[PDB]
Short mmCIF file of C-alpha atoms in Angstrom, two decimals:
data_model
loop_
_atom_site.label_atom_id
_atom_site.label_comp_id
_atom_site.label_asym_id
_atom_site.label_seq_id
_atom_site.Cartn_x
_atom_site.Cartn_y
_atom_site.Cartn_z
CA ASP A 1 0.00 0.00 0.00
CA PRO A 2 1.79 3.14 -1.20
CA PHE A 3 -0.30 5.23 1.21
CA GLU A 4 1.07 3.10 4.03
CA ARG A 5 4.55 3.59 2.60
CA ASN A 6 3.91 7.36 2.54
CA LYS A 7 2.99 7.24 6.22
CA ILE A 8 6.21 5.37 7.00
CA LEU A 9 8.13 8.01 5.08
CA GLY A 10 6.69 10.75 7.30
CA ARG A 11 8.70 13.88 8.09
CA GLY A 12 12.22 14.08 6.79
CA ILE A 13 15.08 16.33 5.96
CA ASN A 14 17.27 16.71 2.90
CA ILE A 15 20.99 16.39 3.37
CA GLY A 16 21.78 18.68 0.48
CA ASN A 17 24.79 20.57 -0.85
CA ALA A 18 26.44 17.18 -0.50
CA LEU A 19 26.27 14.25 -2.97
CA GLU A 20 24.46 16.32 -5.62
CA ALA A 21 27.42 18.67 -6.03
CA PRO A 22 29.95 17.60 -8.68
CA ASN A 23 31.92 16.04 -5.84
CA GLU A 24 30.87 15.56 -2.23
CA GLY A 25 32.00 18.54 -0.16
CA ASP A 26 32.29 20.90 -3.13
CA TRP A 27 29.13 22.68 -2.00
CA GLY A 28 29.99 22.68 1.68
CA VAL A 29 28.53 19.48 3.09
CA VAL A 30 29.97 16.02 3.60
CA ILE A 31 27.46 13.49 4.93
CA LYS A 32 28.86 12.54 8.32
CA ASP A 33 27.65 9.30 9.87
CA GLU A 34 26.72 11.12 13.08
CA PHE A 35 24.24 13.27 11.15
CA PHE A 36 21.95 10.24 11.22
CA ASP A 37 22.00 10.12 15.01
CA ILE A 38 21.29 13.85 15.15
CA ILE A 39 18.40 13.63 12.70
CA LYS A 40 16.80 10.52 14.20
CA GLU A 41 17.09 11.86 17.75
CA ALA A 42 15.39 15.11 16.70
CA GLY A 43 12.34 13.10 15.66
CA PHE A 44 12.57 12.81 11.87
CA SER A 45 11.37 9.64 10.14
CA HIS A 46 13.53 9.88 7.01
CA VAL A 47 16.35 11.54 5.13
CA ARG A 48 16.33 12.52 1.47
CA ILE A 49 19.71 12.20 -0.21
CA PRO A 50 20.16 14.11 -3.48
CA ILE A 51 22.73 12.26 -5.61
CA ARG A 52 24.41 13.41 -8.83
CA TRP A 53 25.00 9.93 -10.25
CA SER A 54 25.55 11.36 -13.73
CA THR A 55 28.99 12.76 -12.92
CA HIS A 56 30.04 9.40 -11.43
CA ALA A 57 29.22 7.11 -14.34
CA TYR A 58 30.93 6.68 -17.69
CA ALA A 59 29.64 8.64 -20.67
CA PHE A 60 29.83 5.65 -23.01
CA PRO A 61 27.86 2.38 -22.91
CA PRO A 62 27.16 0.57 -20.67
CA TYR A 63 27.44 3.83 -18.68
CA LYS A 64 28.85 2.03 -15.64
CA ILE A 65 28.62 3.83 -12.31
CA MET A 66 32.09 4.21 -10.81
CA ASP A 67 33.01 1.83 -7.99
CA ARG A 68 34.16 4.27 -5.33
CA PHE A 69 31.04 6.40 -5.69
CA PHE A 70 28.72 3.38 -5.52
CA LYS A 71 30.47 2.32 -2.32
CA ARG A 72 30.03 5.80 -0.87
CA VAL A 73 26.31 5.82 -1.61
CA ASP A 74 25.99 2.36 0.00
CA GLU A 75 27.73 3.75 3.09
CA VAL A 76 25.34 6.70 3.33
CA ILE A 77 22.19 4.62 2.84
CA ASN A 78 23.30 2.03 5.37
CA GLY A 79 24.29 4.75 7.83
CA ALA A 80 20.74 6.09 7.76
CA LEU A 81 19.12 2.64 7.89
CA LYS A 82 21.22 1.81 10.96
CA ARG A 83 19.30 4.48 12.89
CA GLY A 84 15.90 3.31 11.69
CA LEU A 85 15.52 6.22 9.26
CA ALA A 86 13.74 5.68 5.99
CA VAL A 87 15.78 6.88 3.01
CA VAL A 88 14.97 8.54 -0.29
CA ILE A 89 17.62 8.38 -3.00
CA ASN A 90 17.29 10.02 -6.40
CA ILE A 91 19.01 11.16 -9.56
CA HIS A 92 19.71 14.87 -9.04
CA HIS A 93 21.19 17.55 -11.32
CA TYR A 94 21.45 15.41 -14.40
CA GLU A 95 21.68 18.54 -16.50
CA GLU A 96 22.47 16.93 -19.86
CA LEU A 97 19.25 14.91 -19.64
CA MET A 98 17.25 18.12 -19.17
CA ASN A 99 19.01 19.84 -22.09
CA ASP A 100 18.82 16.88 -24.47
CA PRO A 101 16.62 14.03 -23.20
CA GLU A 102 16.85 12.23 -26.56
CA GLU A 103 20.61 11.82 -26.36
CA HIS A 104 20.59 10.83 -22.68
CA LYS A 105 17.56 8.55 -22.47
CA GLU A 106 19.46 5.28 -22.61
CA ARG A 107 22.16 6.48 -20.22
CA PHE A 108 19.51 7.58 -17.71
CA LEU A 109 17.79 4.19 -18.01
CA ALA A 110 21.14 2.46 -17.54
CA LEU A 111 21.66 4.40 -14.32
CA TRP A 112 18.32 3.18 -13.00
CA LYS A 113 19.06 -0.39 -14.07
CA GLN A 114 22.26 -0.27 -12.03
CA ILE A 115 20.77 1.53 -9.03
CA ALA A 116 17.79 -0.84 -8.88
CA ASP A 117 20.13 -3.82 -9.20
CA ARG A 118 22.31 -2.47 -6.40
CA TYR A 119 19.46 -1.85 -3.96
CA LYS A 120 16.73 -4.34 -4.86
CA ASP A 121 17.32 -6.37 -1.69
CA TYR A 122 17.76 -3.39 0.63
CA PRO A 123 14.96 -2.82 3.20
CA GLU A 124 11.47 -1.67 2.22
CA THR A 125 12.14 1.69 3.87
CA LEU A 126 14.40 2.71 0.98
CA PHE A 127 12.58 4.75 -1.69
CA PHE A 128 13.61 5.29 -5.33
CA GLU A 129 12.95 8.80 -6.64
CA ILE A 130 13.19 8.69 -10.44
CA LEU A 131 14.46 12.17 -11.30
CA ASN A 132 14.74 15.44 -9.46
CA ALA A 133 12.79 18.38 -10.87
CA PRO A 134 12.61 17.66 -14.63
CA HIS A 135 12.72 20.89 -16.64
CA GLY A 136 13.81 22.57 -19.86
CA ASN A 137 13.76 20.38 -22.94
CA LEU A 138 12.52 17.54 -20.76
CA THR A 139 8.98 18.88 -21.14
CA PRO A 140 5.92 17.64 -19.25
CA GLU A 141 4.89 15.41 -22.16
CA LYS A 142 8.39 14.01 -22.61
CA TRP A 143 8.63 13.42 -18.85
CA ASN A 144 5.42 11.37 -18.87
CA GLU A 145 7.02 9.08 -21.45
CA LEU A 146 10.43 8.98 -19.77
CA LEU A 147 9.10 8.30 -16.29
CA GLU A 148 7.13 5.35 -17.62
CA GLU A 149 10.27 3.98 -19.27
CA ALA A 150 12.06 4.34 -15.93
CA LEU A 151 9.20 2.59 -14.11
CA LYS A 152 9.49 -0.30 -16.55
CA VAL A 153 13.24 -0.59 -15.98
CA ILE A 154 12.95 -0.44 -12.21
CA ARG A 155 9.99 -2.83 -12.02
CA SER A 156 11.77 -5.37 -14.27
CA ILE A 157 14.24 -5.67 -11.38
CA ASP A 158 12.41 -4.62 -8.22
CA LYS A 159 8.74 -4.88 -7.28
CA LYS A 160 9.36 -4.24 -3.58
CA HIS A 161 10.44 -0.60 -3.27
CA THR A 162 8.12 2.35 -3.53
CA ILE A 163 8.99 4.70 -6.38
CA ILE A 164 8.70 8.48 -6.08
CA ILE A 165 7.63 10.44 -9.15
CA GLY A 166 8.04 14.19 -9.48
CA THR A 167 6.52 16.84 -11.72
CA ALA A 168 8.06 18.64 -14.67
CA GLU A 169 8.61 22.40 -15.13
CA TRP A 170 11.07 22.34 -12.20
CA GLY A 171 9.12 20.03 -9.89
CA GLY A 172 6.48 22.34 -8.42
CA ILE A 173 2.73 22.62 -8.83
CA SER A 174 2.71 24.29 -12.24
CA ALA A 175 2.91 21.00 -14.19
CA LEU A 176 1.07 18.76 -11.74
CA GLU A 177 -2.08 18.74 -13.87
CA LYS A 178 0.03 17.47 -16.78
CA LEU A 179 1.55 14.57 -14.83
CA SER A 180 0.48 11.05 -15.75
CA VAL A 181 1.38 8.03 -13.66
CA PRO A 182 0.58 4.81 -15.56
CA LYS A 183 -2.34 2.81 -14.18
CA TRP A 184 -0.30 -0.41 -14.21
CA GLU A 185 2.07 1.03 -11.59
CA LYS A 186 0.59 0.54 -8.12
CA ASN A 187 3.37 1.41 -5.65
CA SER A 188 4.38 5.01 -6.25
CA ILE A 189 4.20 8.33 -4.43
CA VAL A 190 3.97 11.65 -6.26
CA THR A 191 6.38 14.35 -5.11
CA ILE A 192 6.10 18.13 -5.31
CA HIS A 193 8.62 20.76 -4.28
CA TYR A 194 6.91 23.63 -2.54
CA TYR A 195 8.70 26.95 -2.41
CA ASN A 196 5.88 29.44 -2.87
CA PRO A 197 6.02 32.36 -2.76
CA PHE A 198 9.25 31.77 -4.68
CA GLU A 199 10.25 35.42 -4.27
CA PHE A 200 10.09 34.99 -0.50
CA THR A 201 11.84 31.64 -0.17
CA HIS A 202 14.62 32.41 -2.67
CA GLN A 203 15.20 36.09 -1.96
CA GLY A 204 18.86 36.95 -2.48
CA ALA A 205 19.76 33.47 -3.75
CA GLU A 206 23.01 34.07 -5.66
CA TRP A 207 22.10 31.50 -8.33
CA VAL A 208 18.63 32.85 -9.11
CA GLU A 209 18.16 35.57 -11.74
CA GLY A 210 16.85 38.83 -10.31
CA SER A 211 16.52 37.50 -6.78
CA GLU A 212 18.28 40.50 -5.23
CA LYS A 213 15.10 42.46 -6.00
CA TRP A 214 13.29 40.26 -3.47
CA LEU A 215 15.56 40.85 -0.47
CA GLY A 216 13.60 41.88 2.62
CA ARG A 217 10.35 40.27 1.50
CA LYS A 218 8.29 39.17 4.51
CA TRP A 219 5.74 36.38 4.92
CA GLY A 220 2.89 35.81 7.33
CA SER A 221 -0.25 37.83 6.59
CA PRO A 222 -3.71 36.22 6.58
CA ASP A 223 -3.81 36.64 2.80
CA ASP A 224 -0.40 34.94 2.46
CA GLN A 225 -1.82 32.00 4.37
CA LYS A 226 -5.02 31.80 2.33
CA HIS A 227 -3.06 31.76 -0.93
CA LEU A 228 -0.91 28.89 0.29
CA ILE A 229 -3.95 26.96 1.49
CA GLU A 230 -5.53 27.34 -1.95
CA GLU A 231 -2.45 25.82 -3.58
CA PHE A 232 -2.41 22.97 -1.06
CA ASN A 233 -6.12 22.39 -1.80
CA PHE A 234 -5.22 22.12 -5.49
CA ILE A 235 -2.58 19.47 -4.75
CA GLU A 236 -4.91 17.57 -2.45
CA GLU A 237 -7.69 17.59 -5.05
CA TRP A 238 -5.26 16.21 -7.62
CA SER A 239 -4.17 13.50 -5.18
CA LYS A 240 -7.79 12.49 -4.51
CA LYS A 241 -8.69 12.43 -8.20
CA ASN A 242 -5.56 10.52 -9.24
CA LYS A 243 -5.43 8.30 -6.14
CA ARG A 244 -1.71 8.85 -5.51
CA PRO A 245 -0.08 9.77 -2.18
CA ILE A 246 1.77 13.07 -1.88
CA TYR A 247 5.33 13.76 -0.68
CA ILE A 248 6.49 17.36 -0.44
CA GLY A 249 10.09 16.35 -1.05
CA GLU A 250 11.54 19.85 -0.72
CA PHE A 251 10.32 22.99 1.03
CA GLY A 252 12.27 25.71 2.83
CA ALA A 253 13.27 29.37 2.92
CA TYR A 254 16.76 30.73 2.30
CA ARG A 255 18.80 32.19 5.16
CA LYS A 256 18.69 35.69 3.64
CA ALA A 257 14.97 35.84 4.41
CA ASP A 258 14.20 37.35 7.80
CA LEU A 259 14.21 34.68 10.51
CA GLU A 260 10.78 35.52 11.91
CA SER A 261 9.23 35.15 8.43
CA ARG A 262 11.14 31.90 7.84
CA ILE A 263 9.73 30.47 11.06
CA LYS A 264 6.16 31.52 10.25
CA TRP A 265 6.29 30.14 6.73
CA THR A 266 7.97 26.88 7.75
CA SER A 267 5.68 26.25 10.69
CA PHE A 268 2.54 27.08 8.70
CA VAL A 269 3.39 24.93 5.70
CA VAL A 270 4.19 21.96 7.95
CA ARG A 271 0.89 22.26 9.84
CA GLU A 272 -1.00 22.41 6.54
CA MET A 273 0.89 19.45 5.07
CA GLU A 274 0.11 17.44 8.21
CA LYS A 275 -3.60 18.23 8.00
CA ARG A 276 -3.47 16.63 4.55
CA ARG A 277 -1.51 13.57 5.75
CA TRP A 278 1.34 14.26 3.35
CA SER A 279 4.93 13.19 3.84
CA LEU A 280 7.46 16.03 3.69
CA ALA A 281 11.18 16.78 3.68
CA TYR A 282 12.76 20.10 4.61
CA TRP A 283 15.36 21.73 2.37
CA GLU A 284 17.87 21.48 3.94
CA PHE A 285 19.83 20.20 6.96
CA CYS A 286 22.82 22.47 7.52
CA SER A 287 23.68 24.79 4.61
CA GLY A 288 22.17 27.96 3.10
CA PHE A 289 18.62 26.91 4.03
CA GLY A 290 19.94 25.15 7.12
CA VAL A 291 18.35 24.48 10.48
CA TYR A 292 21.27 22.74 12.20
CA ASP A 293 24.69 24.25 12.93
CA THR A 294 27.24 21.47 12.46
CA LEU A 295 30.03 23.46 14.12
CA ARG A 296 28.08 24.40 17.26
CA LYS A 297 26.08 21.16 17.18
CA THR A 298 22.85 23.02 17.79
CA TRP A 299 19.48 23.25 16.07
CA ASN A 300 17.67 26.48 15.50
CA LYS A 301 15.09 25.64 18.12
CA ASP A 302 12.25 27.58 16.51
CA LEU A 303 12.78 26.05 13.09
CA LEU A 304 13.15 22.57 14.58
CA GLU A 305 9.87 23.07 16.45
CA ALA A 306 8.30 24.21 13.18
CA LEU A 307 9.41 20.97 11.51
CA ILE A 308 8.87 18.54 14.39
#
């Protein structure tokens, strides 16, 4: 029952700026084994681990994933499982696939063949997330085709693990209506990344065009809350109509946003996700959107309370 699997997934946190960088540590985070103690003790049910497999596999057939990297991913997954955390792994920042899905289709499918083969006998609390935030030339209609091809590859190997399927147009709500999950697939969860209002959550983000114009933006008015509720109602209606569970696999506000607004937004979205029985994972543990200080070994207490 994928709804039961969604319940098991529960509340989680992304350990980002880590394995989805070109190399682990490049973006500031190395996944320390003790992080899993910290996260489990704080009350989280799962971790989401973004992984840039594409830079750690050969470019030519059979597109073999490199040994040392595979071993590292094993180590991370098992570290989390040791603490009784559920684990979401994905394919993250496969930029060539977004820019030319035709050229990279078979390589992408080869990655999933290898990942499914590697983890098919791992515990049922490991989840396979097909592809992070499809966008660009990987259009909604092309994604519907590609995700089905990936489902077929994974299911040819593994009919035990729940699969997590995102939306196109950068993984938010805008392309949810366009998403199609094949009827034959019966053990999947649909994932959405929720960052609205984008101008608030990404204000001052150095990698986002024109974001400096958003610096100082607050969040918390009654109207702000009603707008967010309307969007959550839209997602919930889609879930009910399509009979698929919902995982909000990323949500969070950047550190440049005022702390009081960050707390209000984070706490509110979590309460509203909970009312809808969704699973959820905060972006992210300890970096630019972070809630834990790895030097001081302390949580931001208000943000941790918001997440529970």
